[model samples]
Target chain A: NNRYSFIGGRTGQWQVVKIRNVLGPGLQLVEKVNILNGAVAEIPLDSAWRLQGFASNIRYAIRTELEALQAVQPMLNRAEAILAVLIPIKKSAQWWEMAQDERRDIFERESHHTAVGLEYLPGVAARLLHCRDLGEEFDFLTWFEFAPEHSSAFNELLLRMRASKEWEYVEREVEVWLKRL
Target chain B: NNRYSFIGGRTGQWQVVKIRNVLGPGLQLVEKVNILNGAVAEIPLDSAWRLQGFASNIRYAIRTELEALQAVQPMLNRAEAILAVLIPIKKSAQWWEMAQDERRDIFERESHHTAVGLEYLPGVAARLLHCRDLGEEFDFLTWFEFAPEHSSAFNELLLRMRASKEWEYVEREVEVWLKRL
Candidate 1:
């Protein structure tokens, strides 16, 4: 619905989670993450992080998958949902150069990306953001929100996604953990 | 001596090399690299690349390595030096957080980061670009120029560096090959 920015620096509403690198080079560690929503004009000059993207409608999901996702996916800001993760990813050129339908085929038909997510639904809520159009450093920014109890499930979901065929196109990905203050 | 930029898109003086990713995710492929030197104001909006940095004084090199490097290292723009490689790299937070002397110890005392390059000297001419201070996407942009005959030596140099302890701190690296037009 709106553009979002994740800045890693001092004195943010969300405290840093001290997470390790899941894929590619890790970000310069910061003590806090300043989460800004709705078209920020300028970011802090001193901040080490500079990730921005727009939360758009699901692109690859079919009607069935969309309906299924709506049925089980939990709403954001639940009292129990304290943990949030910002995973910024960039796919290789080969993937982007492919036709949209071809990309959909790889994302869902062969990779079962939707089917796999259905298994972990309800517990781990997510919002997929698109940035490839903005010509930002990264292509996609996936913001995930979940409760402390679902941490293991989130990990499993990530592990499964990383192992999928669609992931072959992923050239860069960084996972940053955050908790509400 | 001055700021440099590697813009990837169309009709640059440097032809694209079609090189695959050496480590981490690869960059979005571009047809040509508009090599801009001496401070470019605005890059081409349509370009898929946005890399900029300054060619600064050597930081880690001691007296011996500096002197030795000056001896054998060939000059850039040599008629025979047709092959050029631009490798942009970022170290992890852990590496940057270390004390300067501590990092120097790991870079040379234990890892022999400079000594290793001494072996492949003369064959590969390199210029180190600094961006960490500029808050760019990558911390260092290393541009190496070599002749076709020394391509193998360049690869060997890379292999050795990747195998060293210093590489452990490297979280992101992308190798882009370019040829003079």
Candidate 2:
């Protein structure tokens, strides 16, 4: 990946990072490996967040996928306040090492991953932009848009997703509050 | 002014901070000075950027304001790389001293602030949300959305505007890039 970002948070504060990767004095060996060794890929965030509204969502149907793209949509057509978040997450090597069936069990059949998201449905539309294999920043760029009015529903949705079986493998995930201009 | 946030670099590092006003221990003097001493007022971004599109741009009638509200549709209606920025600026007491006739002269007649923005036309749309005398962090909230294709023109537009007679009175300005999610 030519670009990667670093983000961290403290008790009352959080961070957002967009990297453009590779060698740097402060960049640790793991970050170098993430870019050179292809641990995860990066996707071009560009305008996908806005374009997703007009296009249909059709994620590659995989045996081990945490979400069903068909259900995703742009939730903020009208708004009083807008909060946009870009999350980049990496799955652990051990998670990927698991046989496809084991991964599938945790991802879908056993975990009810899709069902959890379906609960939030159209109110909290989310898009998973594949960054892995592309070697950009985070392995998966998760884009979410919603009106401030939906804050509680969105928070509960996230709490559930992060507590799921699939999230245990998430090695790294950073949240950014994007102010829609 | 009661709060300050510092974000640093591409090493995947970032930080965010928000605090209530005055007497904050971690705050020190800069924050204190900004708070009780009238360092500068602060304003909530409050999705005013989104609201501006529906309302007419009448700081009223600049004889020169940029594109009519009708022509101000976001340029990246499709998709590519888009960067959105929201800037809130406060005027200095010295400038606020001017009479209405002089304020008009510096703001439009002499500054041709309107003329500078119109130069970018449909490529860049701008709106000045009035917040001054409103007990907010800023006197005016400035909004701009443009594509990379218009980067050059946008930069030039800002260069001339910042150099205008009116800009000399800018006491506080905070700028943040927003993504159109």
Candidate 3:
């Protein structure tokens, strides 16, 4: 329904009219159009110069997309490690104090938590961490990065233990307790 | 110089006396001693009770730790997705406008960014994402979670294209773009 026109004229006697339709039924319409002397051109492909620019733009866009996708693995890995270490420490402490029925209830709750947590990790990091070949050093680093608060918490626990003589005895007791495990 | 005494009043007698003669010797010595007539009690040990308690405690602790660790995964994943999507879109736009020399400079910069990003990911997510055994569906999901912003960005781009009345042209361009890739 939309139409466009371009006209050119001589000083004495100009052409009567020039007309063009930019869009037609069931046809792709370029984003921007320029008309010159009854000619139509898309902005990005109007000339060889523009075409080169467009090609370069497309290439860069693809490269950027690829790079972003690649970055996903490390982020996910760090999160996974944090979870792994924290879970063990929390579970060990909880198990020490609860009754059997309470333990079962806690386990169910914890399991749900684990499921929910996994849901949060980005897809790329999740995939990389799950891989068997992702070296141990990287794995350790990932864990380290994931739970910075947990690390601080662990440090605080250690400091508290050092400050309390009773906790020194408890530390010894834990060694014995862990041996049983 | 100073002396102390311990006496049994019930027995109406001096039970013990200790003398510290500082003038006589540089080291103090006890001059007298007394013994009390009593038996040390023998306590009964409950092995079954101890074992049950230990087992229950261990279970509870393990569960608690696991749950706590699991709790943080979602947040990490969400962050990863945000970073992934935004970084790519930004990079793509930048790349679109760059010259060849600028592209090379950016490519180097991006390499560093990728390395840094990889280092940042948490271990658990990394392992999960990288695992070859997890299959493509799980990997895709992990990626989806990690870079949800990219998905949303793509959707936005599509919507804008449609709203601008350039959907057909963009779609055709995209098809051609994919073929080129």
Candidate 4:
């Protein structure tokens, strides 16, 4: 365990363990952003293990769903700060009880998860990871990056999306806002 | 609209609005408990808003999944010291994709979220909020309160659970720690 010895640190209210890069698959690089104070922590403690790779598309297609709603380059490219929110959704038993086609309709047509997101075009951008397949705690891991100028708009976009029909199935969620180091 | 008047205050990240003595059905009185410092906040900002009452169950049943793991009374009733944590989790699709029995097998029977928690016993107590139903932010809000004596034990408990089978689903999680104010 000492090969990757655990270092202690603080992140908001919780005590954390910081571990340096292990050079995992597809992880071009890894760094931890301190949310409380903008200091480059001794080790990246939190789960903000950012990603990408050229052969990546060969392994997995990392496409941008909200295509037009984002910038030409990337929000993170010039991001002054970032807010990483972990969203875990619990589908109602009734939802699972519905037909596959029926579920599709509510998820797309009724819920407007996609259409509504595009409304905030060019102001907010997000990366949604389908987590259930990975055996993770959350159903979807939504990572959003935007410049400070668009912070409120990004928030407004959150308001619109959360109030949507799609979010009705969210049985529980916690929002953790942080600024990149 | 101003009968109650408009008011707002600063908390950790976002600006919050707080009101006191909200005489709703079950709650005859309600107050915010600030953990920013060991002293009660004048305006009671930060984590000031604590709730209770029958109407609350009806209005908001923000109960957590691990209700059986903790005891109600404070483990550090007179310790005057406390550590509070807000853990938000997101599950991966692979986890949900598994068979029901399989999920259960890895979850309780294997992952041991409860088992590790129980090991800590009376020295530690937790209050978890189920967030999906409300469609707010993250999926689970795991709050912990404990005395200084067993602080290290509590840390061990966290490491064990996070490394457990169930944690594989945590796509994103933010843990905040605070002292009793």
Best by DockQ: 3
Stretches off by above 4 angstroms in model 2 are A1-181, B1-57, B60-81
Residue-wise C-alpha lDDT for candidate 2, range A1-181, written one tens digit per residue: 2223322221111122233221121222111111121222232332111110011122223322323434454444436435655565778777655543356568766567776767766667565654443333445666676776777887797788788888888867655554444
- Interface RMSD in angstroms for candidate 3: 28.1
Write down the TM-score for model 3: 0.14
Best by TM-score: 1
TM-score, candidate number 2: 0.33
By TM-score, how accurate is candidate 4?
Answer: 0.33
Worst 10 residues of 1 chain A by lDDT: A55-64
Interface RMSD score of each model:
23.0, 28.5, 28.1, 17.3
Local accuracy by lDDT, each model: 0.79, 0.47, 0.24, 0.43
Query: How do the residues A134-156 of candidate 3 rate in per-residue lDDT, one tens digit apiece?
Result: 11111111111234434455444
Show the colliding residue pairs in model 1: A25-B171, A171-B25
lDDT of 4 by residue, B1-181 (tens): 0011011223342122222221112111122222231212233343323311110011111123235433433553345445544344656657544543455557667886656666777777665544332232344545566778888998789778878877777665654455554
